[PDB]
Give the backbone structure.
Amino acid sequence: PNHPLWYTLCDRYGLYVVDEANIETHGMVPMNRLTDDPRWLPAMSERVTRMVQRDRNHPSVIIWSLGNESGHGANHDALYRWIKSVDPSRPVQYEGGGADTTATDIICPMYARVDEDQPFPAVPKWSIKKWLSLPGETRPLILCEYAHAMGNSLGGFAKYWQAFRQYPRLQGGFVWDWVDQSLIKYDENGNPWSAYGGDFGDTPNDRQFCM
Amino acid sequence: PNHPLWYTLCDRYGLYVVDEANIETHGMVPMNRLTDDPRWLPAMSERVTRMVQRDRNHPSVIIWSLGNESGHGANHDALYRWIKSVDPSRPVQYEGGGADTTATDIICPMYARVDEDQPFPAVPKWSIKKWLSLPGETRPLILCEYAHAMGNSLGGFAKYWQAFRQYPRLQGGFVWDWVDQSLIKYDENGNPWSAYGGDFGDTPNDRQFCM
Ligand code: NA
Ligand code: NA
Ligand code: NA
Ligand code: NA
């Protein structure tokens, strides 16, 4: 969840907001180790419930998210249902566990391609066009992250938009992402320069992957 | 309906048969002028009922068809339901009226393309990949006619097969069609040559379109 003023400004200027619980357990092995453990349900529930209690009156918020990259565990199912019960006015989405689990109203993959399947075991990233018509699938598809804009990038962006416009149930997505996460450092003169991962003696690091 | 020996041979050799009623009213304006007229129901019913009564024991017949290019009329709905009631063992398909009407268990367009929509009013031919995922649509898609093999043709045939293999619910199609409808004619010498439309004094005609 963002700074409270962010919602107010989105209300007044006009932007659709996905308000997202502060839950990411990307580093766990497997990714759902904590989110499937009932002993972590209380901690997780507070991050969902106190978000809804704070933000539910903002018109700009149109979708709740259960967090990010925490696999899919039973705690997600529990908290999905809690929101649907407490606030029927907004869809709930969550990408973990394959983007189309029982804890999401919206098929919301990250980095699924327009035409090409990426059939990883357990968590495949189908072509977005194919995903829509998998037997029994009815949900709309909106990418929670796509067109990774790292450095000299956004190649093939037009291909997404052509498909967004042709397929009613492909309703767009969220580019990853808005702003380079570079920090300002100084040399011996007093000249500012853009510092990324590794430039503060930090180790292990993932380097320029913040930008 | 075919010569009775056809079904026997398809039973023994192993081919899947779509058995189709002898109903085509293509030249009406509009196409359903007869099939929506309750006075033509008796005549239509006998073409459907008598086919089912003849052929229902043949294992090779796996799908019933209500005919071809006769628009979509209320008589089609009546007869669709008569088959479903009399023989639950086989799906019913019918292409008229836009290939996805209430009178078909299978989306069965003729000459719908792989990626390109052809948005004709009332009876659009959506791209087959798009058709699958239209809001609310659940049925499988099998083209009753595709890849027009007229003379030097079948360009793009591979594009169809790639999509059939990638999309579970795209379950193939029927090429149009098997055999050139040329006839053997003779001249002053006694030369056997191949004759198409018009070569018999017949007027009006549509020429090489029979091949
Ligand atoms: Na769309
Ligand atoms: Na990053
Ligand atoms: Na298929
Ligand atoms: Na023809």
About this structure: The helical segments of chain B are 5-13, 41-55, 74-86, 128-132, 157-166. The beta strands of chain B are 17-20, 61-65, 92-93, 141-146, 170-175, 183-185, 193-195. Chain B has one domain: 1-211.
